[PDB]
């Protein structure tokens, strides 16, 4: 009676479109993939001052969704035998050998359980020497492996170690190896001069234009930029790993493996994992201030569900991201905004749309 493309458009209009007015968001891209059919919805402006409309070429900052590519790079290196998750960083970054940080394994760095790493490096840490000094001077606090504290330095160090293991800088690992293996054409650590015209401005809480600041180990933690079509291709790879070459197939499957529990949230590699079907409140609880900002004692997985779903939020000063996929239903959703909106609104909108689709 109404074509599938129009039904998805109507659901996204009902649930995502009102957030633009509510939070004064200049631009938004919402993608759905179902049964290998991609649906792209674009709203508003990539640049207010240049009057440039959001389109399929628009490049957004992914923020912490960048961690999913770092995790994928880690999975790739492990399954090629370049690293083991039981290894310590000193094995690859020789200047960390026999330092206290060398008592933390790569899996613990990737999944934020060092027991003494905060969300950000200190502001003063900028250069490679300052990053090295920081990790050399690092001392434990909580028992290693027992406490989850969401941390850019933690997965940043994991990223740097993965890069050393593949004998390339981290930016080249993604741009030359991982992005091409996933078939991504417009995904960047460094947006080249020829694509700056497609790079959206972010907008802060006063709707002033801004972009991400350079930082220590930024690329592996929050430094990736992508388009809606690329992020839908990335969700396709996660929904259909069997259709990709062996190396990247095993990489993707590695990122789906739950490592521990924090109540109903299973920490996989980058991805957060949930028993499917999941309640809205289970997905909302995953990004509570308690889980995101504070240390939490982890428990061993005591119930492994047969059927799972996965999501990840991402924010920079000027951009919001949300990606979610459900293997059982062969469906996923990407939301990109050039203004931060509350995580709860991203998760709720996606939940209603993915549960409403026939």
Ligand X SMILES: *[B@]([O])([C]N1[C]=C(C2=[C]C(C([N])=O)=[C][C]=[C]2)N=N1)OP([O])([O])=O
Using rule CB under 6 A, residue 64 touches ligand X = yes
Which letter, b or e, does each residue of 7-38 get, where b requires 16 or more Cβ atoms within 10 Å of its Cβ?
ebbebbeebbbebbeebebbbbbbbbbbeeee
Q: Which of 39, 92, 147, 150 is catalytic?
A: 150
- H or E element in which residue 273 lies: strand 272-275
Active site residue 150: yes
> If you ran DSSP here, which 8-state letter would residue 264 be given?
T
Cis amide leading into 277 (omega within 30): yes
Using rule CB under 6 A, residue 129 touches ligand X = no
Q: Which of the ranges 107-115, 138-146, 237-245, 313-321 carries the binding residues for ligand X, by CB under 6 A?
A: 313-321
Give dist(CA 213, CA 186) in Å, integer.
Answer: 21
Site residue total, ligand X (CB under 6 A)? 14
Q: Which two three-digit tokens encode residue 150? A: 């969401």
Using rule CB under 6 A, residue 75 touches ligand X = no
Give dist(CA 29, CA 56) in Å, integer.
Answer: 8
Using rule CB under 6 A, residue 152 touches ligand X = yes
Alpha carbon of residue 215 to chain centroid: 17
Active site residue 64: yes
Q: Least distance to ligand X from the beta carbon of 222, Å?
A: 4
What would the x/- binding string for ligand X be over residues 199 to 238, using CB under 6 A?
Answer: -------------xx-x-----xx----------------
Q: Least distance to ligand X from the beta carbon of 293, Å?
A: 9
Which of 242, 87, 108, 245 minimizes the C-alpha distance to 178?
245
Using rule CB under 6 A, residue 151 touches ligand X = no
What would the x/- binding string for ligand X be over residues 282 to 301, using CB under 6 A?
Answer: ----------x---------
The one among 15, 315, 337, 338 contacting ligand X by CB under 6 A: 315
Residues in the chain: 358
| Cβ–Cβ under 8 Å, residues 232 and 82 | no
Alpha carbon of residue 321 to chain centroid: 8
Using rule CB under 6 A, residue 149 touches ligand X = no
Chain contacts with ligand X (rule: CB under 6 A): 63-64, 152, 212-213, 215, 221-222, 292, 313-317
Catalytic residues: 64, 150
């Amino acid at each position: 009676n109404t074509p599938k493309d129009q039904e998805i458009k109507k659901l996204v209009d009902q649930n995502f479109k009102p957030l633009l007015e509510k939070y004064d968001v200049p631009g938004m891209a919402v993608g759905v993939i179902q049964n290998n059919k991609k649906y792209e919805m674009y709203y508003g402006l990539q640049s207010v001052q240049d009057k440039k409309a959001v389109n399929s070429n628009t490049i957004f900052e992914l923020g912490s969704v960048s961690k999913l590519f770092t995790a994928t790079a880690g999975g790739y290196a492990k399954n090629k035998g370049k690293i083991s998750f039981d290894d310590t960083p000193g094995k690859y970054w020789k200047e960390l050998k026999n330092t206290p940080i060398d008592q933390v394994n790569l899996l613990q760095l990737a999944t934020y359980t060092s027991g003494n790493l905060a969300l950000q490096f200190p502001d003063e840490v900028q250069t490679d020497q300052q990053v090295l000094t920081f990790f050399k001077d690092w001392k434990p606090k909580n028992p290693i492996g027992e406490y989850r504290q969401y941390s850019n330095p933690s997965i940043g160090l994991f990223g740097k170690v993965v890069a050393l293991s593949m004998n390339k800088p981290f930016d080249q690992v993604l741009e030359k190896t991982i992005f091409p293996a996933l078939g991504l054409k417009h995904s960047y650590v460094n947006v080249p001069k020829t694509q700056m015209q497609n790079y959206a401005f972010g907008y802060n809480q006063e709707n002033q234009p801004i972009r991400v600041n350079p930082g220590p180990l930024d690329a592996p933690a929050y430094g990736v930029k992508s388009t809606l079509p690329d992020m839908l291709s990335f969700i396709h790879a996660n929904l259909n790993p069997q259709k990709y070459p062996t190396d990247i197939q095993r990489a993707i499957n590695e990122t789906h493996q739950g490592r521990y529990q924090v109540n109903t949230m299973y920490q996989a590699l980058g991805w957060e994992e949930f028993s499917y079907p999941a309640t809205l409140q289970t997905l909302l609880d995953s990004n509570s201030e308690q889980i995101v900002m504070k240390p939490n004692k982890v428990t061993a997985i005591s119930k492994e569900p047969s059927v799972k779903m996965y999501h990840k939020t991402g924010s920079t000063s000027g951009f919001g991201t949300y990606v979610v996929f459900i293997p059982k239903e062969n469906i996923g959703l990407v939301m990109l905004t050039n203004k931060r909106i509350p995580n709860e609104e991203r998760i709720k909108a996606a939940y209603v749309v993915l549960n409403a689709i026939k």
